[PDB]
Amino acid sequence: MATQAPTFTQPLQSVVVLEGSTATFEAHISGFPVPEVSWFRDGQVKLERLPGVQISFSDGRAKLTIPAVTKANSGRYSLKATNGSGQATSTAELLVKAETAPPNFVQRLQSMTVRQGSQVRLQVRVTGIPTPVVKFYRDGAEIQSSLDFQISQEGDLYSLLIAEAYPEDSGTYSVNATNSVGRATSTAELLVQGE
């Protein structure tokens, strides 16, 4: 209701972002009348002139997102909010790193002896940048995920859940994790006893 120069309630913060991911910047702006906002890269380059960006603004929340980020997106990013009483600027740097790491089993496949009808969970925890591809095998054959053999991922934790184990399920289970910079394999034996 009373006039007041623009200000950033939440400013931009510099961030390091992994190659290929989506970088996002968000700010909260106040001011009356409602400030007009413009995004810039490297000082003088109007951001809406560069391809592959999404800029939105509503109710004093300004958001810039850059999907599929690459090293060419690194630079200094600025948000300018302006009305008749003044003009405010928030600036942050975006640095895009590769940061590659080959696949690593922080939790290895674990050998197990269970009884028939038991439910058995075969878990690994796998790190890696780019995120590795994780596949489960029994005796060298890839396991197709089904309701009885259910492969799932939660974070870096990958689980094969055998709904009810029978002797026919015994064998050497293995997990392969591969990304663009390395490979890793964990093997284990599963034995399920009969009658």
Residue numbers in the entry: 1 to 195
Reproduce text from the manuscript describing this model.
We have developed a functionalized, modular biomaterial formed by the controlled self-assembly of two proteins. The ZT polymer is composed of proteins of human origin produced recombinantly in bacteria. It is based on the naturally occurring complexation of the protein telethonin (Tel) with the two N-terminal immunoglobulin (Ig) domains, Z1Z2, from titin in the Z-disc of the muscle sarcomere. Specifically, its 90 N-terminal amino-acid residues become “sandwiched” between two antiparallel Z1Z2 doublets, forming a wing-like hairpin structure that builds an intermolecular β-sheet across the three components. The display of peptidic sequences on the ZT polymer is established, with sequences having been introduced both in Tel and Z1212 components without preventing polymerization. Both components permit fusing peptidic sequences to their N- and C-termini and, in addition, Z1212 permits the introduction of motifs in four internal positions, namely the CD loop of each of its four Ig domains.
However, they possess a surface exposed loop, the CD loop, which is a region of low sequence conservation. We have demonstrated that the CD loop can tolerate drastic diversification in length and composition and have established its suitability as a locus for peptide grafting. In the Z1Z2 variant carrying the decorin motif KLER in the CD loop of Z1 (Z12KLER), the motif replaced five native residues so as to become inserted between residues V45 and L51. This insertion point was chosen as the V and L residues in Z1 corresponded to the natural flanking residues of KLER in decorin (VKLERL). Decorin is a protein associated with cartilage homeostasis that binds to collagens and plays a role in their stability, organization, and fibrillogenesis. In decorin, the KLER motif is located within a loop of the leucine-rich repeat 3, the region that binds collagen and the incorporation of this sequence in a PEG-peptide co-polymer promoted chondrogenesis of human mesenchymal stromal cells. It was envisioned that the CD loop would constitute a structurally suitable area to incorporate the KLER sequence. Interestingly, the overall pattern of exposed Lys, Glu, and Arg side chains with a buried Leu sidechain is preserved in Z12KLER, but the main chain adopts a slight helical turn that causes the side chains to be positioned closer together producing a compacter KLER motif than that of decorin. Given that loop sequences can undergo changes induced by their binding targets, it remains to be established whether the observed difference affects the biological function of the engineered motif. In conclusion, data on the various variants establish the suitability of the CD loop as a locus for peptide grafting, capable of supporting the display of bioactive peptidic motifs on the ZT polymer.
